[PDB]
Design a protein around this ligand. Structure first.
Ligand SMILES: Nc1ncnc2c1ncn2[C@@H]1O[C@H](COP(=O)(O)OP(=O)(O)O)[C@@H](O)[C@H]1O
Ligand SMILES: Nc1ncnc2c1ncn2[C@@H]1O[C@H](COP(=O)(O)OP(=O)(O)O)[C@@H](O)[C@H]1O
Ligand SMILES: Nc1ncnc2c1ncn2[C@@H]1O[C@H](COP(=O)(O)OP(=O)(O)O)[C@@H](O)[C@H]1O
Ligand SMILES: Nc1ncnc2c1ncn2[C@@H]1O[C@H](COP(=O)(O)OP(=O)(O)O)[C@@H](O)[C@H]1O
Lengths: 435, 416, 416, 416
């Protein structure tokens, strides 16, 4: 509650859908990817390309060069970026962003881009903190107005119950905390860390002996340090009309102390990863900011993604591949994703059903794959959630084809919804056939 | 600042949906062809049910609802049914995309105000108050008509006190002299009895609390767009409401209940609006965002002529759960017309209902439903108690529909 | 304010031009087909020589340079060669037109900052300093490790002094008591020896002086876009730099040396930018403006759809000396690839150089040059010390070029 | 502001009265010729007893005490005995009339300060404190060395708390991060144990509370007349002491105990001083004013040469209860000398006591008592442990008395 470490904030608005990805799924010596490993499935060339890119950064063969992931919608662009992010470490900052989010009436584009980059540059300090280690006995979740829960954690000598806030419950669910797990909670940061499990489950550390003070490494982004030393953003801040902008005087104060600690040796700067979805949405001014920022030594890995082949360079009257400034295209490393084969699609949806704890009948997944083929992975992944509740209403043991048929009939994908609205207002072809 | 808060609602918006009591579904989540005010639109009503179930199951993490259909396909009605199925006295805020275009108010500032109209407070209270002008002499206070075993505060005997059984709280007019002028801290003796029991029940939205505290008597200010500036509700005021609302929840007195923000003409919203809504959907406290579009393909406002589905950007469309709303059959229209007639008090012949249906077929439901009120006047003026086919035929000629109105004005060979 | 100034350069920009040592011309101004890192582009290299000669002869009164060619035709390289041929450690500032589009910084304010990066100071000094804590008793001062015939200033014996042989300049810690608190004007005794000889040699640009004096320890500020405002370098600060720089020149200590401002994507600049550059070319102190365009016909930014040569307005084009840069032959490309390989440390088979050349033929030099680094990783990971044709074939599939990348995304009958 | 207050006393004043333990009276209020340090002065000691009885009976409504006698007749001693007979640790403030004549401080402002030195606080406390960093989980707090069924305030679990059993009161260093800088509200973990029992006993005067709160470490300020201004104790500060003292009494924690203000050289006080004392005697809270005069007839200071009794104005004399103090017999003096010797540690021969008595006969007791200390030095320097008649004879010649000192200086036929 005093601070919030980089680990628990990793890809905040995009983690849930990409929860299964534990890494890039590649071998360390030969960079050859395994067909299906570390969550990722069948995007071999892109996964190998990403692996070669990550090594180039480590080796220092590229500098001030951004990563571009071009491919059709729902082809693992956001997934491979998360896979790259995971392979750098859990204590490496990872910021996700839709290029549209820069254009808001609340804050300036410069502020939005500043916060984005500040969130992806971590500050590492070794400091004393009270660490609560133990065995999970019972986790309770009951969702002021929002989630409120209880964690019953034990050591061989102590038995205690702790009330949890919305932020903690989220971090616990992010780390998938189960009754029986051996976890350590940083009391200053709120950092949940899976160490082991006291008793095996679904095919190995013993319950701790003895809350203890330890010299621990704390990685906290520049944006969080800004937030901590700024006025506390109160309850209902989103609907209060208060802009999330950070006062320059506070930023100056933090930048000087961070520069002091780096020089003194009290701190080391940990550049992470900044992911920008919908890059075709950024303007000429935005890309210039990215240029200036990429020239810095503390610059994070700027990974960005586009679904559009050719787009207009926003702010100019010129067009280009993915709508990137022609000077910017030269520096960037382009990685391409392609559509999945029906067999490649079924594995992905089956993994997402497991991450959602939904049991599909062999035939329900088959239709969920036919749906994924035509209307993409995104819409299909949303259908699992709806099918779960349509089956629950009729009290079913598993989600059947009847339920997947219902979700698809009740809820439309964009291609059918446009086709609906259009044909309902105007008839293109008359009863005789004439247009 | 205030506990006794008066709630305000824009009733003109929910006027045509006086009959919609709910979705009209069964136990297994299947819509009955004619139930709770609804006639047809079964699949869309069922899909709205799956939605109210997902909200109750807490699976609408950062998801929205998109009602895609033509004009008068019961979109605003389904949106209202969602708030009704969600529970009792749940906030429902229906707004259009064109409303956001304000000359003095910022696009997102109006969006923020309607979000506050869609977040409420359920205050269930039974205040066991003991008030009046005051271990020996344990209890003893007097009211204007009464006097009545048993924390210790900076107050002496002979002062007006107010203490509740559940929560403890804190000089009288009786001892005030005319020689003491304005140094005064004197309060009058409380009216009624010492022991008071009040059944306090309030269903007010954040906006109702803001508008009440903006007032330093207010009905005229409600019935007015008094000043061009409208600088009454401020950031500091909103924060003060939020802090005192949080205190009420922490005491377990009030329930923060998120409602339904319904945005019709969703294509009118720009990128800046959609990014405000993206940030909103992220919040757990946030209400459900239900969008509506009668547009198949529309340009993205704030984008370089990028035409997309329903004029909703890809990033925001992803989050939305698209529900299609179908047009009605002449028989289906007749039922709706009849339901509207009985709610409005008017009554017409089966033949007059038939002609109203004929207008609901060519032009939407919305236009033909407007034909009841003038025909009621036309029948009553003649000396009738029931509206006939002649009065519907007169009203259709007296009051024209937007499309028919424009075509004759152009005509003084029309195509496309 | 400061004499010991640390110079800063954006090395990422001059990274691909580590091999260009100069233009590679002879005594009579004719380019040798392969010299000083260059391969071919003889006529353009010769034309760049005529330019560096005109600057040295002082005939470039208010004239510029326009490098017209396609992508990867050695424009940025020729621009760098111009600074190298002009003399030793001459400022070279390569920027693109798109860089000028800053959200917080005014279009001409960024242009002004890069002009300061292209105007330098050559400080050749041999400071014969005699410092330490002090016609009878002519000379006598002491240092932290030493003590050592021979204007008269407001300083007494027992004070720390600093006087240079070429220019005369102006209480010690030894006599400071703890009873005297903060009324203090006490300085410590200088470390080392009394007689000091320093070989002071500085090649810093106006921008290096501004950034140093903006700092009231700074490496992090250099490795950061710390604040969104960036209000450190101000008009008053710039003026103060200019006044103290003018003093250094008037003393014959420093040389104000104008460098090369290279602006790639010249068509991106507007009328307001071009009028800033017109005013710049007028100044004698101003550096050489070298523009670059890969556009034949482009619209004048800030003009009503007036399409002109290279997107440069007529008034500014007049001033420019247009030099055309030609594409390369597959043999010419192979040489460049080989030179780049040896500079980068990588080494590949003649067959792998052949495939890289094949990509440099269809797509530009810039793309195929990017194919070396991943193939080096691909070969080393396998267990190779030399890159083969198989690794170039793998790298071309792993890392795509902008045109090829877009075409497959559109394909999910492409023409024009 | 502070509970733990350190008391300060001007001990040099009460130095010669180390032997006076009380008045030395019996049960029926009759003075024993030799008791509680006293020798003779029976009637005056008895009269002082009647006075301490009247104060205890509350009959000294607005009355004072006037001790009329010659120099060294035990006036200051009787004044001290009054405070001792009044009770345990009762404030006693002995001052002279000449003290009031301050250059920077107003005549009544010094009188006001000595009144505060004569009004105290008896704080009898047994604090049952439970402190440390924090119906389920009823009690649980930890100290630096310990941890330990069972109002509800704005404090969460993990914060440092302090709550006493008799009166309820209100973030820890353990969760404080280095990333959070100066936004800090973090307190360290309390040392010792959770359950603490303290025997709090304080006997401090209003002045001790003022001087402690004037300090924002202070012993030097006590051992100094640091600044000529001395603007530390202010009206606002005094009021703040009075308000917090009143709170301590209203809680029944402390007892406001009025002491004894002894004013020697009473004739030195003017009309303005006497009117300040008239207003003081009126107060019930006020201490007993005990005045002393060695003057028979003296002019009223602040009056037109109006000579009155003891230099006290008629209006103020009325209020006073005049007690006469008689001179002593050579035998009576010898006893006092012996008592003083045994308290001071010194010891002398009966013959040396006889000579000291001879000086106490002609000159006062005060002078001859001063003859012990130098004679002790004179005997010890010789090599004696006991003082002889020769050392008293030497000390009388070495150290002269005011009258004898002046007479020889005039002589270089003296009368009247
Ligand atoms: N190769 C893959 N392996 C596993 N899951 C994948 C893969 N590609 C996509 N997914 C999953 O499919 C869903 C949609 O794909 P996503 O990565 O978001 O698409 P996009 O290419 O449009 O960024 C997500 O839940 C994502 O994790
Ligand atoms: N299925 C239905 N059952 C009953 N009334 C309906 C139905 N569909 C529409 N209506 C009514 O028709 C009128 C206009 O329809 P409305 O809800 O405004 O649709 P839309 O929002 O698509 O224009 C309202 O009075 C509405 O309650
Ligand atoms: N004639 C040449 N000789 C040697 N290297 C060259 C030559 N032409 C281009 N290059 C190199 O090719 C790369 C890309 O060319 P560049 O100078 O950026 O051209 P442009 O500015 O026209 O895009 C650089 O590494 C550059 O030094
Ligand atoms: N009756 C007495 N018994 C004992 N000591 C006495 C007596 N009278 C005077 N003294 C002592 O003699 C000294 C001087 O007398 P003091 O009290 O100052 O008298 P005064 O105030 O009249 O000058 C003090 O040490 C005092 O205690």
């Amino acid at each position: 509650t005093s601070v919030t470490e980089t680990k628990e904030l990793r890809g905040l608005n995009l983690i849930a859908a990409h929860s299964h990805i534990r890494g890039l799924g590649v071998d360390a010596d030969t960079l050859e990817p395994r067909p299906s490993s570390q969550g990722l499935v069948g995007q071999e060339k892109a996964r190998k390309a990403a692996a070669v890119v990550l090594e180039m950064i480590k080796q220092g063969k590229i500098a001030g060069r951004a990563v571009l992931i071009a491919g059709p919608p729902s082809t693992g662009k956001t997934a491979i970026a998360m896979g790259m992010a995971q392979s750098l470490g859990q204590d490496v900052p990872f910021t996700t962003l839709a290029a549209s989010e820069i254009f808001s009436l609340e804050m300036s584009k410069t502020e939005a881009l500043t916060q984005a980059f500040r969130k992806s540059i971590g500050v590492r300090i070794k400091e004393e903190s009270e660490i609560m280690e133990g065995e999970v006995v019972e986790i309770q979740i009951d969702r002021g107005g929002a989630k409120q829960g209880k964690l019953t954690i034990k050591t061989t000598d102590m038995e205690a119950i702790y009330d949890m806030g919305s932020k903690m419950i989220d971090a616990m669910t992010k780390e998938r905390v189960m009754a029986g797990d051996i976890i350590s909670i940083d009391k200053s940061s709120g950092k949940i860390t899976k160490l082991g499990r006291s008793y095996a489950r679904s095919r190995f550390l013993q319950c701790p002996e003895g809350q203890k003070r330890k010299e621990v490494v704390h990685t906290v982004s520049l944006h969080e340090i800004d937030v901590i030393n700024s006025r506390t953003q109160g309850f209902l801040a989103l609907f209060s009309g208060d802009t999330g902008e950070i006062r320059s005087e506070i930023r100056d104060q933090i930048n000087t102390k961070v520069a002091e600690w780096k020089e003194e040796g009290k701190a080391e700067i940990v550049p992470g990863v900044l992911f920008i979805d919908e890059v075709h949405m950024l303007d000429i001014e935005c890309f210039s900011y990215i240029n200036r920022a990429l020239e810095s030594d503390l610059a994070p890995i700027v990974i960005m993604a586009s679904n559009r082949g050719v787009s207009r360079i926003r702010g100019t009257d010129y067009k280009s591949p993915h709508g990137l400034p022609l000077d910017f295209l030269d520096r960037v490393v382009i990685i391409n994703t392609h559509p999945y084969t029906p067999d490649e699609l079924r594995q992905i949806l089956s993994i997402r059903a497991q991450e959602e704890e939904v049991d599909l009948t062999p035939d329900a997944l088959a239709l969920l794959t036919k749906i994924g083929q035509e209307a993409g992975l995104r819409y299909a992944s949303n259908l699992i959630t709806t099918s779960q509740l349509i089956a629950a209403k009729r009290r079913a043991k598993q989600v059947g084809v009847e339920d997947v048929q219902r979700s698809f009939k009740l809820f439309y994908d964009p291609a059918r919804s446009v086709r609906f609205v259009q044909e309902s207002e105007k008839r293109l072809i008359g009863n005789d056939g004439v247009v | 600042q205030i506990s006794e808060v008066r709630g305000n609602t824009r009733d003109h918006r929910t006027a045509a949906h006086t009959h919609i009591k709910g979705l009209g579904l069964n136990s297994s989540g299947i819509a009955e062809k004619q139930a709770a005010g609804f006639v047809g639109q079964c699949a869309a009503r069922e899909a709205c049910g799956v939605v109210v179930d997902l909200i109750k199951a807490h699976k609408m993490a950062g998801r929205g609802v998109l009602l895609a259909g033509g004009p008068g396909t019961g979109k605003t009605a389904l949106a209202l049914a969602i708030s009704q199925e969600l529970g009792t006295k749940i906030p429902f805020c229906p707004i259009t995309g064109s409303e956001i275009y304000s000359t003095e108010v910022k696009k997102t500032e109006v969006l923020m105000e309607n979000f506050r109209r869609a977040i409420g407070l359920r205050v269930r209270e039974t205040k066991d108050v003991y008030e009046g002008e005051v271990s020996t002499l344990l209890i003893g206070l007097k009211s204007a008509r009464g006097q009545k075993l048993d924390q210790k505060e900076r107050v002496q005997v002979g002062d007006v006190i107010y203490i509740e059984t559940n929560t403890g709280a804190c000089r009288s007019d009786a001892y005030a002299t005319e020689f003491d002028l304005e140094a005064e801290e004197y309060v009058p003796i409380p009216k009624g009895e010492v022991h008071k029991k009040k059944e306090i029940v309030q269903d007010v939205t954040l906006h109702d609390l803001d508008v009440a505290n903006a007032r330093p008597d207010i009905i005229s200010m409600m019935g007015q767009l008094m000043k061009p500036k409208m600088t009454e509700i401020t950031d500091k005021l909103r924060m003060e409401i939020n802090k005192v609302v949080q205190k009420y929840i922490n005491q377990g007195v009030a329930e923060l209940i998120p409602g339904v923000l319904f945005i019709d003409e969703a294509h009118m919203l720009d990128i800046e609006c959609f990014t405000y809504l993206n940030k909103a959907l992220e919040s757990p406290i946030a209400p459900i965002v239900v969008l509506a579009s009668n547009r198949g393909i529309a340009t993205i406002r704030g984008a370089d002529d990028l035409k997309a589905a329903h004029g909703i950007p890809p990033d925001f469309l992803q989050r939305l759960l698209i529900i299609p709303t179908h047009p009605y059959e002449p028989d289906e229209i007749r039922r709706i017309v009849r339901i509207r007639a009985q709610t409005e008090g008017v009554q017409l012949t089966d033949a007059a209902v038939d002609r109203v249906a004929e207008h609901g077929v060519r032009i939407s439901l919305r236009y033909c439903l407007q034909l009841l009120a003038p025909a009621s006047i036309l029948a009553r003026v003649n000396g009738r108690t029931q509206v006939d086919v002649q009065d519907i035929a007169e009203a259709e000629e007296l009051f024209l529909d937007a499309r028919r109105s424009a075509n004759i004005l152009t005509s003084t060979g029309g195509l496309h």
